[PDB]
């Protein structure tokens, strides 16, 4: 159950590349507790499979390096995340972000694109709803639009992930449309759910006016305000918040759509590792210092949430690892994995100090990026990068001739620290996670 | 509890896809033992990363199914297997079979293509060599030619994995060549190593005659006979072997090159999931029933070896998962993974009964194959397959424009069962495995 897993010394020497300093048995035994968890922090790396973790560690920490956050969780396993074909009820081997998020948030598999409903389109209670009912404070943070599938899945039940605001819901989710007697769009359901802390992007959908209900005629932003939400839009105002609860829930909208990525780098290109020079990532100039980082949002949320005596449930998402993978941009993708790692560190620090917090880090599904040899002549998009080791690493994206690289169906890493973390070991399913969390918090 | 990880019931219903029956904590706590391992069985799936495991599970057992061998090991983790650049000593992100096998068998990183030597070309003792010196019985089994990198790394120290027999060694490993005062070719060093049980293919190199030494002029096969090796060529003859020890070592040569693969299927093709119908694998008609399977070899080895009072070390390899992956042949690859699972079952059956056996299952490195959506338009080679779920699964090979798909550098799964199995949990390095085994057995 060690906390340092970097190579011991000279990687060219016998025992120099070892990450273990001694026998794990006793330490591992010491880290196994079935006592209840008072708090739960679930961090999700959207599209962050074992390959994405390996490529980012290699680049930012070196092959023999180690992520202080991501690599430091002691109990590890692999889990399945296949979705279901809506018509046949048969497995669909490659899930989208919607079906997987619904799986761990409700405990039931579903079809790609479904948010909070099963294949029969019937609603099921999310872990956040249950937490909130039991008295626990709740948080939902992401670097994506708050309407994005992952944060959405905890607070909305729609038949199609595209039902962002009133206008799209009427056309695509008529059965959920407010005017038609439904629960409403994702954004409307988010506002109704009222998690104590909610932070991310997606301010543009809040400019839509409701078509019905008690607040028809007013923009979703006007409604938020009208219903007691504290609205912050940058790091400064985010930091000046001193409390967030059911009387004053916090809602931060730091971007119109998705928040900007941390690093800039060119897009992989065909034979890019051969015909183009190796690249070194640089900071994204389009990203203002006023836009809080994932670690900052995570830290503020933890502070506001831990004020609750009963406990809290918090979900944090590093969204753009997935987005940059789709875009075949190694620097964008790696920068986002580094960003997530910082957030994991904040979580682990609190968890170790507090002692009754279960921390889980995993991804919703695998993705395209592969690490290949320097001289690889590949059919897809490639790019050579200068790593921290002073060596060249080539990344390949070879599963799509279209303008977006695809998710993949491989089982991937799930790691945890704290009470009930043992339930993450061995092979499990993404739906087992819902139950693991439900049982750790003693939720009925 | 920890033995059954199949979906519980109806995968479309809440809790239906769950693999866990209850809380793992106490069960996991019970399996943590730091007492000495009397025996060690290391099973290697060449090129068998998490993707390959998922593809084969989905196909053979369905998405919610589970491998009775491969998926039944309770302690799991992920490990790194990067090699080293010979000139610079900097990490080489994508290893080959030779550099990786050397890392787990000697405990030191090395350059791609090296067997039993570090980047300075200095020999280091293997775990088999140390087991043999300590009085334990030793076995080396593989479905590849016995000169293949993986089995070879346990008994040979050469600067190039190409140094199969006398001729190749003369021109590629002059400093190892017998005529120039070296230890000899891989096959010669193998014969010198004298493990109690050695089973595999690669009979063609044994037809070579030694150039120098005590047996110059005689084929290596005759030399084998001259030194007291019992030679078997088929299942019937293997089965009649009563004992195998230092005075009557067993040498099984089941094929000229690599042993034949179990399943047959066409090679993936460009837009194959689109232009060609789904395929269903069938048994290989060219495979002679007289050729033993990996589980039959594994089983017999365990039977001969366990006769040794002190203990035994046995390495088992399913080589063709890798070869078929290079060849972009889904059915060949999956069938070899199914073949390995049966061997893992035989090992675990013995281990659970015996009680002092550490069983480890992992791969040397990751590979090319990805599971993609049915409608994917990929730039590489694809193929649709009809799974056990009656659903279509598409596999993609998109990292090479050559006639061979390439390895990938992603960290991958390592799972174990038995005394000291906790040393496989969390993030480790492929070289840590060497130390885990040496420690479990109490070597040095
Ligand atoms: Zn996703
Ligand atoms: Zn995606
Ligand atoms: Zn290999
Ligand atoms: Zn290979």
Contact A49 B410 (CB under 8 A): yes
Q: Are B164 and B172 spatial neighbours (Cβ–Cβ below 8 Å)?
A: no
| CA distance, residue B390 to nearest chain A CA (Å) | 8
Q: Which two tokens stand for residue A255?
A: 């971007």
Interface test with B, best of A18, A66, A363 (most B CBs within 10 A): A18
Interface touch A80/B19, C-beta < 8 Å:
yes
Radius of gyration of chain A (CA): 21
Question: In the numeric block, which tokens belong to residue A418?
Answer: 């704290």
**What is the 3 state secondary structure string of A83-109?**
EECCCCCCEECCCCHHHHHHHHHHCCC
Q: Partners of A412 in the beta sheet?
A: A79
| A61 C-beta neighbours (distance < 10 Å), count | 20
CA angle, A11 as apex, A10 and A16 as ends, to 5°? 65
| Closest Cα in chain A, distance from residue B306 (Å) | 26
For residue B283, the CA-to-ligand 4 centroid distance in Å is 23
Distances (CA, A) of A247 to A151, A228, A244, A315, B203: 22, 7, 8, 21, 79
By CB neighbour count within 10 A (0-12 exposed, 13-18 middle, 19+ buried), where does A289 fall? exposed
The CA distance from A264 to the nearest CA of chain B, in Å, is 23
Q: Between chains, do A93 and B62 touch, taking CB under 8 Å as contact?
A: no
* Gap from CA of A48 to ligand 1 centroid (Å): 8
DSSP B277-317: --B--EE-TTS-TTSPPHHHHHHHHHHHHTT-SS-EEEEEE
d(CA A343, CA A337): 10
CA B283 vs. chain centroid, Å, equals 22
Cα of B264 to nearest chain A Cα, Å = 23
DSSP-derived secondary structure for B154-215: TT--BS-TT--SHHHHHHH-TTT-GGGTS---HHHHHHHH--SEEEEE-GGGGGSBPSSSTT
CA dist., res. A254 & res. A243, Å (int): 19
CA neighbours closer than 13 Å in the CB half-sphere of residue A119: 19
Separation between Cα atoms, residue B232 and residue A126, nearest integer Å? 61
From chain A, the residues in CB contact with B370 under 8 A are 368, 370, 399, 408-410
Give the pairing of strands B312-318 and B137-145.
parallel
A97 included as an active-site residue = yes
User: Which among B384, B354, B360 has a CA at the least distance from the CA of B372?
Assistant: B384
| Contact residues, chain A, for B78 at CB < 8 Å | 50, 76, 413
User: Which H helix or E strand runs over B137?
Assistant: strand B137-145
Tokens of A297: 């949002």
Helix, strand, coil tally for chain A in percent (to 5)? 30, 20, 50
- Partnered with residue A233 across adjacent β-strands are none
Q: Residues B177-194, buried b or exposed e (16+ Cβ, 10 A)?
A: bbeeebbbbbbbbbbebb
In 3D space, the residue among B34, B61, B92 whose CA is nearest the CA of residue A28 turns out to be: B34
Q: Bridge partners of B359?
A: B41, B417
The residues, ordered by sequence, that sit 6+ positions from A326 with a Cβ below 8 Å of its Cβ are A47, A367, A368, A404, A405, A406
With CA atoms as reference, report the closest residue to A254 among A141, A373, A372, A367. A141
Is B399 in Cβ contact with A398 (below 8 Å)?
A: yes
Q: Which secondary-structure segment (H or E) carries A189?
A: helix A186-193
> Hey, how many other C-beta atoms are within 10 angstroms of the C-beta on B87?
8
Pairing of strands B370-372, B392-397: antiparallel
Look at residue A343 and give its three-state secondary structure. helix
Element (H, E) at A201: strand A197-201
Complete DSSP assignment for A353-412: HHSSEEEEEEESSB-S-EEE-TT---SSEEEEEE-TTS-EEEEEE-S-SSSSPPPB---E
Task: Give the N- to C-terminal CA distance of chain A in Å, as an integer.
Answer: 31
Contact by Cβ (8 Å): A198, A238? no
Query: How many Cβ atoms are within 10 Å of A27's Cβ, its own excluded?
Result: 16
Distance from Cα B322 to the centre of ligand 4, integer Å: 5
| Strands, E assignment, A27-90 | 39-45, 75-80, 83-84
Of B76, B80, B108, the CB nearest to A425: B76
Residues of B within 8 A of A389 (CB-CB) are: 90-91
| DSSP single-letter state for residue A297 | H
| Tokens 């629960």 found at | A183
A–B CB contacts, 8 A cutoff, strictly below = 339
- Whether residue B379 and residue A398 make contact (CB cut-off 8 A), yes or no, is yes
Q: What are phi and psi of B228, to 5 degrees?
A: 85, 20
Mutate to test the interface with A, among B34, B409, B424 (most CBs of A within 10 A): B409
What are the helix (H) ranges across B258-411? 272-275, 294-305, 320-326, 330-354
Give the separation between CA A418 and CA A32, rounded to whole angstroms. 8
Domain around A96: 1-444
Q: Are B129 and B437 in contact (CB under 8 A)?
A: no
Sign of CA dihedral A16, A389, B422, B107: negative
Pairing of strands A370-372, B412-417: unpaired
Which of the 8 DSSP states describes residue B408? B
Question: Residue A359: which of A312, A416, A305, A315 has the closest Cα?
Answer: A416
Residue pair A82/A413 in contact by the 8 Å Cβ criterion: no
Q: Which residues of B touch A11 (CB under 8 A)?
A: 84, 89, 91, 109
CB B401 within 8 A of CB A378: yes
> What does the alpha-carbon distance between residue A154 and residue B196 come to, in Å, rounded to a whole number?
59
Q: Cα–Cα distances in Å, from A163 out to A156, A216, A258, B270? A: 10, 18, 17, 36
Q: How far is CA A122 from CA A117, A118, A175, A179, A362, in A?
A: 5, 6, 11, 19, 27
d(CA A389, CA B93): 10
Q: Per the structure block, which two tokens stand in for B356?
A: 């002092």
The answer to whether residues A117 and A124 touch, using CB atoms and an 8 Å cutoff, is: yes
Report chain B's C-alpha Rg in angstroms.
21
Tokens of A49: 């499979």
Half-sphere exposure of A251 (CA within 13 A, CB side): 30
Phi then psi dihedrals of residue A395, to 5 deg: -110, 140
Instruction: Of B426, B427, B444, B422, give the one whose Cα is nearest residue B436.
Output: B422
Q: What would the 3-class secondary structure string for B92-108 be?
A: ECCCCHHHHHHHHHHCC
Catalytic residue (one of B51, B97, B100, B396) = B97
Closest residue of chain A to B437, computed from CA coordinates: A23
Rounded Cα–Cα distance for residues B178 and A13 (Å): 28
CA of A325 to the centre of ligand 4 (A): 26
Residues of chain B in contact with residue A53, where contact means CB-CB under 8 angstroms, are 411
Closest CA to A311 of A429, A437, A188: A437
Task: Tell me which residue of A231, A210, A265 sits closest to A60, measured CA to CA.
Answer: A265
Which among B23, B370, B399 has the least Cβ separation from residue A378? B399
Experimental method: X-ray
Out of A31, A33, A51, A97, the active site residue is A97
CA gap B192, A203 in Å, rounded:
72
Structural gaps in chain A: residues followed by a C–N separation over 2.5 Å: none
Specify whether the CB–CB gap between A377 and A390 falls below 8 A. no
Q: Could you tell me what percentage of chain B is helix, strand and coil, using 3-state DSSP and rounding each to the nearest 5?
A: 30, 20, 50
* Interface touch B406/A373, C-beta < 8 Å: yes
Q: Tell me if B15 and A391 make a contact (CB, 8 A cut-off).
A: no
Q: Select from A16, A398, A440, A441 the residue whose CB has the most chain B CBs within 10 Å, as the one to mutate to test that interface.
A: A398
What residues in B contact A51, CB-CB < 8 Å?
366, 408, 410
CA B121 to ligand 2 center in whole angstroms: 45
Please state the domain count of chain A. Answer: 1
Place of tokens 């994991």: A344
Q: Kind of pairing, strands A75-80 and A426-429?
A: parallel
**Cβ contact (<8 Å) for A20 and B103?**
no
Check if the beta carbon of residue B110 is closer than 8 Å to that of residue B169: no
In three-state secondary structure terms, A150 is helix
Contact B43, B343 (CB under 8 A): yes
Q: How far is CA A190 from CA A4, B70, B263, in A?
A: 40, 42, 51
Give CB contacts under 8 A, 24+ apart, made by A54-57.
A54/A371, A54/B80, A54/B409, A54/B410, A54/B411, A55/A330, A55/A333, A55/A334, A55/A337, A55/A369, A55/A371, A55/A393, A55/A395, A55/B409, A55/B410, A56/A333, A56/A334, A56/A337, A56/A338, A56/A341
Is B198 within 8 Å of B252 (Cβ atoms)? yes
- For the CA atoms of A311, A315, A316, A320, the dihedral, rounded to the nearest 10 degrees, stands at 180
Length of chain A: 444
- State the Cα torsion A246-A252-A257-A260 to the nearest 10°: -140
CATH of the domain at B36: 3.40.720.10
B141 in Cβ contact with B316 (< 8 Å): yes
- B357 dihedral zone (left: phi>0; alpha: psi -120 to 50; beta): beta
Which run of H or E residues covers position A435?
Answer: helix A430-440
A298 close to A238: Cβ distance less than 8 angstroms? no
Whether the CB-CB separation of B374 and B56 falls below 8 Å is answered with: no
Spatial separation of the C-alpha atoms in residues A187 and A172, rounded to whole Å: 15
Distance CA B269, CA B381 (A): 4
Terminal Cα-to-Cα distance of chain B (whole angstroms): 37
DSSP string, A207-253: GSBPSSSTTTTSBHHHHHHHTT-EEE-SHHHHHT----SSSS-EEEE
B328: left (phi over 0), alpha (psi -120 to 50) or beta: left
Ligand nearest the Cα of residue B362 is 3
């Amino acid at each position: 159950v060690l906390e340092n897993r970097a190579a011991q010394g000279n990687i060219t020497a016998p025992g120099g590349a070892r990450r273990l300093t001694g026998d794990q048995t006793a330490a591992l035994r010491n880290s196994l507790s079935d006592k209840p968890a008072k708090n739960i922090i679930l961090l999700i790396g959207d599209g962050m499979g074992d390959s994405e973790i390996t490529a980012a560690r290699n680049y930012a920490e070196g092959a023999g390096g180690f992520f202080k956050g991501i690599d430091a969780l002691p109990l590890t396993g692999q889990y399945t995340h296949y979705a279901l074909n809506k018509k046949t009820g048969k497995p669909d081997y490659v899930t989208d972000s919607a079906a997987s998020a619904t799986a761990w948030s409700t405990g039931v598999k579903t079809y790609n694109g479904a948010l909070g409903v099963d294949i029969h389109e019937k609603d099921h209670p999310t872990i956040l709803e249950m937490a909130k009912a039991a008295g626990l404070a709740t948080g939902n943070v992401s670097t994506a639009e708050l309407q994005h599938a992952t944060p959405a899945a905890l607070v909305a039940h729609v038949t199609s992930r595209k039902c962002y605001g009133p206008s799209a819901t009427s056309q695509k989710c008529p059965g959920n449309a407010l005017e038609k007697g439904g629960k409403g769009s994702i954004t409307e359901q988010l506002l109704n759910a009222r998690a104590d802390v909610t932070l991310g992007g997606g301010a543009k959908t809040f400019a839509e006016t409701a078509t019905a209900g008690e607040w028809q005629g007013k923009t979703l932003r006007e409604e938020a305000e009208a219903r007691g939400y504290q609205l912050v839009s940058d790091a400064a105002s985010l930091n000046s918040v001193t409390e967030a609860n059911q009387q004053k829930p916090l809602l931060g909208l730091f971007a119109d759509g998705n928040m900007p990525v941390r690093w800039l780098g060119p897009k992989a290109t065909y034979h890019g590792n051969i015909d183009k020079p190796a690249v070194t990532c640089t900071p994204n100039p389009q990203r203002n210092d006023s836009v809080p980082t994932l670690a900052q949002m995570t830290d503020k949320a933890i502070e506001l949430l831990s004020k609750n005596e009963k406990g809290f449930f918090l979900q944090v998402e590093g969204a753009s690892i997935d987005k940059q993978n789709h875009a075949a941009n190694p620097c964008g993708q790696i920068g986002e994995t580094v960003d997530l790692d910082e957030a994991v560190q904040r979580a682990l620090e609190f968890a170790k100090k507090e002692g009754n917090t279960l921390v889980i880090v995993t991804a919703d599904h695998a993705h395209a990026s592969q690490i290949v040899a320097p001289d690889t002549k590949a059919p897809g998009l490639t790019q050579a990068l200068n790593t921290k080791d002073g060596a060249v690493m080539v990344m390949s994206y070879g599963n799509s001739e279209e303008d977006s690289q695809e998710h993949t169906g491989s089982q991937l890493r799930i790691a945890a620290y704290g009470p009930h973390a043992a339930n993450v070991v061995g092979l499990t399913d993404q739906t087992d996670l819902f139950y693991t969390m439900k049982a750790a918090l003693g939720l009925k």
